[PDB]
Design a protein around this ligand. Sequence first.
Ligand SMILES: [Mg+2]
Ligand SMILES: [Mg+2]
Ligand SMILES: [Mg+2]
Ligand SMILES: [Mg+2]
Ligand SMILES: [Mg+2]
Ligand SMILES: [Mg+2]
Ligand SMILES: [Mg+2]
Ligand SMILES: [Mg+2]
Ligand SMILES: [Mg+2]
Ligand SMILES: [Mg+2]
Ligand SMILES: [Mg+2]
Ligand SMILES: [Mg+2]
Ligand SMILES: [Mg+2]
Ligand SMILES: [Mg+2]
Ligand SMILES: [Mg+2]
Ligand SMILES: [Mg+2]
Ligand SMILES: [Mg+2]
Ligand SMILES: [Mg+2]
Ligand SMILES: [Mg+2]
Ligand SMILES: [Mg+2]
Ligand SMILES: [Mg+2]
Ligand SMILES: [Mg+2]
Ligand SMILES: [Mg+2]
Ligand SMILES: [Mg+2]
Ligand SMILES: [Mg+2]
Ligand SMILES: [Mg+2]
Ligand SMILES: [Mg+2]
Ligand SMILES: [Mg+2]
Ligand SMILES: [Mg+2]
Ligand SMILES: [Mg+2]
Ligand SMILES: [Mg+2]
Ligand SMILES: [Mg+2]
Ligand SMILES: [Mg+2]
Ligand SMILES: [Mg+2]
Ligand SMILES: [Mg+2]
Ligand SMILES: [Mg+2]
Ligand SMILES: [Mg+2]
Ligand SMILES: [Mg+2]
Ligand SMILES: [Mg+2]
Ligand SMILES: [Mg+2]
Ligand SMILES: [Mg+2]
Ligand SMILES: [Mg+2]
Ligand SMILES: [Mg+2]
Ligand SMILES: [Mg+2]
Ligand SMILES: [Mg+2]
Ligand SMILES: [Mg+2]
Ligand SMILES: [Mg+2]
Ligand SMILES: [Mg+2]
Ligand SMILES: [Mg+2]
Ligand SMILES: [Mg+2]
Ligand SMILES: [Mg+2]
Ligand SMILES: [Mg+2]
Ligand SMILES: [Mg+2]
Ligand SMILES: [Mg+2]
Ligand SMILES: [Mg+2]
Ligand SMILES: [Mg+2]
Ligand SMILES: [Mg+2]
Ligand SMILES: [Mg+2]
Ligand SMILES: [Mg+2]
Ligand SMILES: [Mg+2]
Ligand SMILES: [Mg+2]
Ligand SMILES: [Mg+2]
Ligand SMILES: [Mg+2]
Ligand SMILES: [Mg+2]
Ligand SMILES: [Mg+2]
Lengths: 147, 210
Amino acid sequence: PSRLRKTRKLRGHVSHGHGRIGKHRKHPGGRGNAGGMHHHRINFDKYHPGYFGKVGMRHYHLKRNQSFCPTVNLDKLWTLVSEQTRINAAKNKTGAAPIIDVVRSGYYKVLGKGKLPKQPVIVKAKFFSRRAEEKIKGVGGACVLVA
Amino acid sequence: APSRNGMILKPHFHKDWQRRVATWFNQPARKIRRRKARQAKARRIAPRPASGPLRPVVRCPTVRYHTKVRAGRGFSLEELRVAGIHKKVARTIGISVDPRRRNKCTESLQANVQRLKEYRSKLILFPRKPSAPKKGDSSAEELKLATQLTGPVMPIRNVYKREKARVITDEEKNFKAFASLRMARANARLFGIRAKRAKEAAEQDVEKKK
RNA sequence: GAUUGUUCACCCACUAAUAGGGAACGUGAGCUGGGUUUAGACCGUCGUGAGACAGGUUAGUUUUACCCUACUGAUGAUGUG
RNA sequence: CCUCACGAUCCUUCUGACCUUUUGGGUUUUAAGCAGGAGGUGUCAGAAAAGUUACCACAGGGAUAACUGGCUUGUGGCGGC
RNA sequence: CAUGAAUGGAUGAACGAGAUUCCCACUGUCCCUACCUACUAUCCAGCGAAACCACAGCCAAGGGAACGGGCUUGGCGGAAUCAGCGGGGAAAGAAGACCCUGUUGAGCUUGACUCUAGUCUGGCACGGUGAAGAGACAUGUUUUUUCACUGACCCGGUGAGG
RNA sequence: ACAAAGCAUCGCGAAGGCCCGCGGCGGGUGUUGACGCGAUGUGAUUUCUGCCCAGUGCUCUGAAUGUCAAAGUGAAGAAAU
RNA sequence: CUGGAGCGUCGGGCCCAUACCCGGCCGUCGCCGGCAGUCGAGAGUGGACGGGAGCGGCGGGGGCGGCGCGCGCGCGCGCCCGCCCCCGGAGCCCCGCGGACGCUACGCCGCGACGAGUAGGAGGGCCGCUGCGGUGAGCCUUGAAGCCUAGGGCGCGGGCCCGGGUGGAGCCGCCGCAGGUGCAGAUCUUGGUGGUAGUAGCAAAUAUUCAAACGAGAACUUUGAAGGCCGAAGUGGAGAAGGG
RNA sequence: CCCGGCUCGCUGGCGUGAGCCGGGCGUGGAAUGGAGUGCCUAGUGGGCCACUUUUGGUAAGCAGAACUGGCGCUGCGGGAUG
RNA sequence: GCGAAAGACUAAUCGAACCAUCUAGUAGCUGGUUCCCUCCGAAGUUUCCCUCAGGAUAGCUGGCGCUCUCGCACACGCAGU
RNA sequence: UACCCACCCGACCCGUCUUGAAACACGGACCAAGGAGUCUAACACGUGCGCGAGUCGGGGGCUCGCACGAAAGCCGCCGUGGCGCAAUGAAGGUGAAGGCCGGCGCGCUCGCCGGCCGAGGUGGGAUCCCGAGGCCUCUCCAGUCCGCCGAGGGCGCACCACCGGCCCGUCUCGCCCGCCGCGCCGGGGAGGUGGAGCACGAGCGCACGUGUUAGGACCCGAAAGAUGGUGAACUAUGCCUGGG
RNA sequence: CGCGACCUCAGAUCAGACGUGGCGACCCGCUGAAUUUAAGCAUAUUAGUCAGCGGAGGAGAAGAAACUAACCAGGAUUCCCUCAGUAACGGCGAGUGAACAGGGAAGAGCCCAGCGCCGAAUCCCCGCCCCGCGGCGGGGCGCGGGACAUGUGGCGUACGGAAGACCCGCUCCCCGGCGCCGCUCGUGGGGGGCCCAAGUCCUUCUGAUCGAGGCCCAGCCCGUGGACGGUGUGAGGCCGGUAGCGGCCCCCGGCGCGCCGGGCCCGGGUCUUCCCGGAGUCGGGUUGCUUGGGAAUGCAGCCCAAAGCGGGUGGUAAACUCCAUCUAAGGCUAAAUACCGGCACGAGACCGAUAGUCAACAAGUACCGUAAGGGAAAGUUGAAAAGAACUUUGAAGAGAGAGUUCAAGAGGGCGUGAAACCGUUAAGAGGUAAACGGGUGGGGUCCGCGCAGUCCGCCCGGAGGAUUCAACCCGGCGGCGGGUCCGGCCGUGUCGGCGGCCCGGCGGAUCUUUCCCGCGCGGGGGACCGUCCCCCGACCGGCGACCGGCCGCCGCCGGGCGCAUUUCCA
Ligand SMILES: [Mg+2]
Ligand SMILES: [Mg+2]
Ligand SMILES: [Mg+2]
Ligand SMILES: [Mg+2]
Ligand SMILES: [Mg+2]
Ligand SMILES: [Mg+2]
Ligand SMILES: [Mg+2]
Ligand SMILES: [Mg+2]
Ligand SMILES: [Mg+2]
Ligand SMILES: [Mg+2]
Ligand SMILES: [Mg+2]
Ligand SMILES: [Mg+2]
Ligand SMILES: [Mg+2]
Ligand SMILES: [Mg+2]
Ligand SMILES: [Mg+2]
Ligand SMILES: [Mg+2]
Ligand SMILES: [Mg+2]
Ligand SMILES: [Mg+2]
Ligand SMILES: [Mg+2]
Ligand SMILES: [Mg+2]
Ligand SMILES: [Mg+2]
Ligand SMILES: [Mg+2]
Ligand SMILES: [Mg+2]
Ligand SMILES: [Mg+2]
Ligand SMILES: [Mg+2]
Ligand SMILES: [Mg+2]
Ligand SMILES: [Mg+2]
Ligand SMILES: [Mg+2]
Ligand SMILES: [Mg+2]
Ligand SMILES: [Mg+2]
Ligand SMILES: [Mg+2]
Ligand SMILES: [Mg+2]
Ligand SMILES: [Mg+2]
Ligand SMILES: [Mg+2]
Ligand SMILES: [Mg+2]
Ligand SMILES: [Mg+2]
Ligand SMILES: [Mg+2]
Ligand SMILES: [Mg+2]
Ligand SMILES: [Mg+2]
Ligand SMILES: [Mg+2]
Ligand SMILES: [Mg+2]
Ligand SMILES: [Mg+2]
Ligand SMILES: [Mg+2]
Ligand SMILES: [Mg+2]
Ligand SMILES: [Mg+2]
Ligand SMILES: [Mg+2]
Ligand SMILES: [Mg+2]
Ligand SMILES: [Mg+2]
Ligand SMILES: [Mg+2]
Ligand SMILES: [Mg+2]
Ligand SMILES: [Mg+2]
Ligand SMILES: [Mg+2]
Ligand SMILES: [Mg+2]
Ligand SMILES: [Mg+2]
Ligand SMILES: [Mg+2]
Ligand SMILES: [Mg+2]
Ligand SMILES: [Mg+2]
Ligand SMILES: [Mg+2]
Ligand SMILES: [Mg+2]
Ligand SMILES: [Mg+2]
Ligand SMILES: [Mg+2]
Ligand SMILES: [Mg+2]
Ligand SMILES: [Mg+2]
Ligand SMILES: [Mg+2]
Ligand SMILES: [Mg+2]
């Protein structure tokens, strides 16, 4: 609101928080992101390094749907499925191992972060990591692919 | 004139946003303009599914989106000769006909056929005249209803089937699922080059012979 | 006084002397406007040219005081019944 | 023998890897990357650039001149030992 | 320094509100001023405006944005005014016309950079008919030189008259 | 100063000079024809008009072995080439 | 101004700043501040509760002393034994049984310390303007806003509050929310008003005078008379365009 | 500081050297005052003057540095005025 | 456009009219910028700049903060010494 | 305190640009009224509130002639997605996990197999816990309760410094390979370095302050440029028709 | 040297139609800058924007793929969210800068040409009648015209269609009238007209009340009505109105039965024969503009210019080569969708007459410029003109009385009525221009007082005078506090009941299709865990959550107590 502004406290205050030596003139520097090479250089070079120039390779027309691929970490599969499906098993005595469609919860790829609880699993996913492989194997249980 | 850490910002107001600004103080009166259509259309077509005709189960395209399903435009043609519904009749019976779908699989064909088979069965064909003959459903199955279907006819919900826990045979537990991806992605990589060498090596067996 | 826009000079002449200076380089609502120094023009030179030239030359609008002051005069003024 | 003796982006070329992309697949050209070198900005942190205006204009400027004034006194003039 | 031949050179009768110079006559141009008249100003009746103004308005010197009205010390000051006057208020008029700078212009110029209308030439297109004849390649193709023709195309005249 | 009359060059025989227009088979000179039209230069009369084609222009039935696009034709290739 | 009010070197004595001291008062910062109901002033514990006993004790340093002592333990009373008793009452400087008047817990209180300011920041504004949601059994024809006041006051001050008159219709206080929000300035915009000032000025064509009329009123109108001018290339007599 | 012990692919006749574990040991010249560290960020980026040092200049109220001190930015007694 | 030629004139306008719109044109440049009190409180210094009337970043400032110490008989640190 | 007056001391006219203004710099006769940091988008930090590995917001829907309403309520919407929940590589793509123990492979600081523990350590680290010893308590001893002091020792967040580790890129080096297939296939090591990485999380939504831009842009303030139109009533020329 | 068909082409004030201007927000073609931006600058941007120009309608355009895609696929348009400020473009810089997928609003599809089939099955214009006539139409009847064989009708159009054979089942739409029946959502469709509660009750203010108390429940009445405006001040009640499936009367709208006149023999499914795409078009070369499209996204001119298992596309040129996906060269269309112009309304954190639009009024008015164009100022008496009759002074303007008014110190530019500014009355001052700061002093106007300001408040002592008590009990009532948690009710933590569990639900990708219903899936039921309820029993916080008794204390009321008490007064 208007009421809670400095401009209220700057009346009778001649130059208006803006200096009477060098006034508030219109557009001293330039207009917007202007003088990046020349003379505003010191910002752009010290504060946004790697702005000026090309790099890399075009992929031109590009569509993200083509390369949609979310990630999950082992870390939290023992979320995706209702926690009761874990409490059931860890127990049960038959080596059930519940199935986890990392598909069905919304992730085109599973990755090996974190601990995994000592508990056999069947993870059906798309693009598994290596480490995700190893951890699941080394716990017990398996890595099934989906198309 | 930037000062000490921000972003760059290419705000695009160098043109003339000012003239062509649409504010939206229609929004709520529009909400209501709309209400009165939804409303009126229903009272006009009294017994008829308010939402609109029956529309097919259909799979979303691009790779990310795969696992979803939709109300499609309309049921295919191939689909109908199968359900035994004439395409020009369907259009009068509140059955939505796209006639522009390449049907590729028996899975999504019969899935989508079952919707028509379902529809027939729970459809009260309200007869041409009052004193009318065949195919119109009887004065009992007629009195019972005046019922507009509020909401989308036979709504398409993305439903999955649970897989019970298993035993994990020592065979699922051997498959190195990472390795086999890398294999896959290299055989698909080089399938073509590899084929040029069979084509050259088959050339050398004839070129050594001559 | 002759010359000279001239300051500056030089000469004739007189005398007693023909000293030197200042006052916003005393003094444009005092003048004049001769020279500078607009716009028009002309020759010299330079410039390829537009054009340049303390290189010459001729024509080129010179405001306003009634206001306070100073001054010059003019009435007057409180005081002395 | 030490202290100078050279140079971004974008652009161009040459080289390097059985490199990556060239995209609905595949093979060859071709093109784009990636990583090193060269072309070069002499205003050297890097504008692709001739004049004139006394026919002139606007923002400004006592931060920039031409008078007046201050200081200074080289020079000038004047005067001592 | 630094003229000069149609960037014309040299002359010159007449003419020039064109620039100089000298002489006679004349003359309040001057010595050096003087007087007279008309209209004013002036005074009155009537009618009555403007420009400008921070506050204002006597001076010396000091200092002081290095020439102040203010202030310091001095000098001093009697109400309200009239005609004059141009010494002062760097008076007014009029964000200096002189000069510098601006990545502010305009007008003009050319050997500036970048372009343009226009024109010259080549190609392609409407864009054909016939005729000769030649070379080049090859052992038909191409290049086509030249000369006609009139159907497009073009120009000529009339009231489309042989 | 300009013009001026006088002197002087220069292009032009109309599918033209010069010229306009945005465009047409558009228009002015032109109700014209070189004693005319267009383009310049100097500036009455008298006397004269000196040398220089080394620059830049202009121009010339001039060689264009200098180069030079498009298209055109030649070739390799599998095609962009 | 002159054995000086001159100049050297020196005394005492005195004079004065927003400087220092003490005090007064108003700011701010800090105090690991106190103060949301409690003992206690270089604080150096307090309390059960037992067994045993009593004038014991804790029979330690010119330390000058700090940690132990001379207002009591035990005692007066009930009579060697009991007690050593209850604040709804000890009578209270300590009170722990319950707590300011004070405690808007962003209130109030004591210490100290400190408070030159352009640009700028920041904070604080029961400083100010207009709008709305709340709220003030707000105010008001028994007189609102504005306006006016050499009417009493208050704040440091933005302003605020009170005294009267006039005015004639509406207005304000708090808690919130909302602004086109507070002027001396911009050769700022518009409207008004001064000084100048009763000032400049009513100067181009030689020219008026008398009498009467009319009239409230006559230099200015009209009539007469007289003097004058334009002076037929006109101030004479008719037209165009324009004017209407 | 001082003891004990381990590790090494470096270094070397052995040790060094470095790294670690484990133990042993306190006010280390004066004076002053509570220390540490992270964001946002305005104005500013024409300055001027003095002692002393000092460069141009002859000299300047001239031009340009050092060092410090002022004014700007901030009055007051004094410095008659500034 | 028109100029016997002088940048003459195009309806008080000419180195090239007036009217409306684009139009809040742009401006490193003039001017101004509106209520109280309290506290802290500069710089005209750094490197790059088509930079010298301006910017860029060095500083200095405020605010916002936080980590802790302990003046609660029982402190380490820092420093124009 | 205010009005007039009186005195004594003080005393230059504000605003502004300015190294320096009373300026012999500029604005400013006086007065009323108007008048200049605004809105939006985007960032960024600071802060307020909701929920929290989520959280939202629309746009849509369902519920109104609105009086209040163009409100409020509600929706597997609620997530179709943004933001976050992971980076790194130009790209194909890979992707944050280590310790330990035993066993097996010659522990060859190489490979594999079973178990245990799970985000490695050091130094600082508010600091919570333990605490030897005091320090009283009417006597000598006994002793449970109760606090104060407390040398010394333990856990140690947050944060800071360091040492370790893991993902990706790139390099170097060098080992063993699996074998739906053949390796110009895929795969595994050691060391170093680049990374806006992981190493037991902090975002999301919504407020508000500040700031920075984009925006007319704090207001005022040009010489120009462009697009379209109107004019020869003046004058310049040409022509037509009149007059002297 | 004739007449006659046709083809081309004229003329008709021929018969009948129609086109042209305007409006112009929104709509469509094109054209088209420069300020501006880049700290210059031309590249770029402003920006395909303004002007210019052209064109439409109640909306405009587009639209039934030569699309999307790379999926396990979708499926006309437009719009909103979203992608996403992203892919790329750029002195790769200022800027620029889209798209594909999903969700949602809405959602409808269709028609030509050709190939062919069918005695042109067609079409147009006349004349006579029958109905119909305020959007000119049906019905019939006419050797009444004419187009059309260079081609008019039906089917048909690619999603297949035609034609055949036999497989199946069986017959209602359309239009011109002409009636009639149900007025057919704001909660009786549109419009108009007409209509529907309750005080001027008392008293009292006031010029006038609409104001203030009161008035059988905040008073009386009404209240599906208390919005608002009017009404000589603030009024639910006076009046218009308001509310109110309130009423009635016209008209208009739309939909339902009958009659009639006309039109129409219109299905569905199987096996075969054949039949197919729109040319100077695609494409290419080029140039020009555009976007973002790119070694060419779009559009252009010119040049070259196709094919039929082809063509386009399948987003860095190209050859080969493999795969996908449409089908151009013909065409229409609601709906959402846009709306600073119009008509007609509704509202506001708005402005409130130097603001608000230039304009509250003779506003696009007065006036200016020749003209394009420019373009103002200016609201208010009171409630009622009741707006000064009449006497008088004054030539008249003006006054003095008087009169009207609640008020003329509201007088026809009139509410209020500031400051500068000027008008005069009173006081005081006045040679250093005024004006200012500090300090006093004198005087005034006012303001407090005092005709003693002796300021109050306790307590006490004394002396006067007067009511009922206080202290005490007893009856009652009401508090408070205490506890026995005594008894009960309440809830916290624990335990027991496995008791709600099916008479307790909801959540969970938990589990069983041993179940049931409907089509392996969906719905339903049944098992499981996590959650939330009953029974009772036990412990404990026994909690502001009470409620009952017992207690202890306080207060009030009523009794007692008559006076060394306990009050009042001086
Ligand atoms: Mg300030
Ligand atoms: Mg300023
Ligand atoms: Mg729908
Ligand atoms: Mg002389
Ligand atoms: Mg002079
Ligand atoms: Mg003069
Ligand atoms: Mg003079
Ligand atoms: Mg002269
Ligand atoms: Mg001249
Ligand atoms: Mg000459
Ligand atoms: Mg020359
Ligand atoms: Mg050597
Ligand atoms: Mg490709
Ligand atoms: Mg391909
Ligand atoms: Mg000249
Ligand atoms: Mg100067
Ligand atoms: Mg100066
Ligand atoms: Mg001088
Ligand atoms: Mg002067
Ligand atoms: Mg510059
Ligand atoms: Mg220029
Ligand atoms: Mg050139
Ligand atoms: Mg010549
Ligand atoms: Mg010659
Ligand atoms: Mg020559
Ligand atoms: Mg201060
Ligand atoms: Mg407002
Ligand atoms: Mg104001
Ligand atoms: Mg005469
Ligand atoms: Mg006449
Ligand atoms: Mg500056
Ligand atoms: Mg200097
Ligand atoms: Mg000239
Ligand atoms: Mg300046
Ligand atoms: Mg001066
Ligand atoms: Mg100035
Ligand atoms: Mg995003
Ligand atoms: Mg320009
Ligand atoms: Mg039209
Ligand atoms: Mg600029
Ligand atoms: Mg620029
Ligand atoms: Mg420019
Ligand atoms: Mg451009
Ligand atoms: Mg563009
Ligand atoms: Mg663009
Ligand atoms: Mg336009
Ligand atoms: Mg689409
Ligand atoms: Mg009412
Ligand atoms: Mg009313
Ligand atoms: Mg009524
Ligand atoms: Mg095409
Ligand atoms: Mg473009
Ligand atoms: Mg089409
Ligand atoms: Mg269409
Ligand atoms: Mg349409
Ligand atoms: Mg007005
Ligand atoms: Mg107005
Ligand atoms: Mg008025
Ligand atoms: Mg008024
Ligand atoms: Mg009145
Ligand atoms: Mg009145
Ligand atoms: Mg009124
Ligand atoms: Mg009045
Ligand atoms: Mg007065
Ligand atoms: Mg008097």
